[PDB]
Amino acid sequence: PNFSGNWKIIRSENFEELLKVLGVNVMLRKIAVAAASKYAVEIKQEGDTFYIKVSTTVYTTEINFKVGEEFEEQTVDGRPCKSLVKWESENKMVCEQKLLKGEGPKTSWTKELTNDGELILTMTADDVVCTQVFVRE
Ligand SMILES: *C/C=C(C)/C=C/C=C(C)/C=C/C1=C(C)CCCC1(C)C
After folding, report:
1. In testing the pocket of ligand 1, which one of 33, 44, 109 has its CB within 8 Å of the most ligand atoms?
2. Domain residue ranges in the chain
3. What is the Å distance from ligand 1's center to 11 Cα?
4. Segment holding 133, helix H or strand E
5. CA 47 – ligand 1 centroid, Å
6. Quick one: which atom of ligand 1 is closest to the CA of 9?
7. How far is the CA of 90 from the centre of ligand 1 (A)?
8. Ligand 1 center from residue 89 Cα (angstroms)
9. Nearest CA to ligand 1 atom 4
10. Which of 3.40.50.2000, 3.30.565.10, 3.40.1190.10, 2.40.128.20 is the CATH number of 1-137?
11. Quick one: which H or E segment has residue 29?
């Protein structure tokens, strides 16, 4: 597959519920949900190496990794973690995360390229799964 692209969000479900599990208070959850309404994901993929830039209106972050090699990023609620991405199939990868310090919910994410040109991101905290769908810009 080629995940490369400038991806624009078209749907976001269960994001507030995810943030609630992660301990974010109500007003900030609503504000974060609003920022997700228009956010972008830019992917450059070369073989098993990924460069990912996630951007909202006022914030941008980069996530760089090679599949199967541990790296450091942050959880959704911003806690530093160690991460490891593996393929689950031709067009889907899964990332397991472990907190660098302390305890907290078990978090992870997945990225899938569908056959109709959508990118599906999921983000999980314990029992709660957020699903977001993007198309290429
Ligand atoms: C592989 C693609 C990944 C890991 C995308 C991750 C995206 C996020 C962690 C998005 C986080 C956001 C917040 C934590 C609040 C502001 C809105 C978002 C959706 C940009």
Report:
1. 109
2. 1-137
3. 13
4. strand 128-136
5. 23
6. 19
7. 23
8. 23
9. 109
10. 2.40.128.20
11. helix 26-36
Closest among 37, 41, 38, 36 to 51, alpha carbons compared? 41
Contacts 24+ apart (CB under 8 A), 76-79: 76/18, 76/19, 76/22, 76/107, 76/123, 76/125, 77/19, 77/22, 77/23, 77/24, 79/104
The string over 110-130, giving b where at least 16 C-beta atoms fall within 10 Å of a residue's C-beta and e elsewhere, is: bbbbeeeeebbbbbbbeebbb
| Nearby residues of 93 by Cβ (< 8 Å), 6 or more positions away | 67, 85, 86, 87, 110, 111, 112
The angstrom resolution of this structure is 2.0
72, β-bridge pairs: 82
Method: X-ray
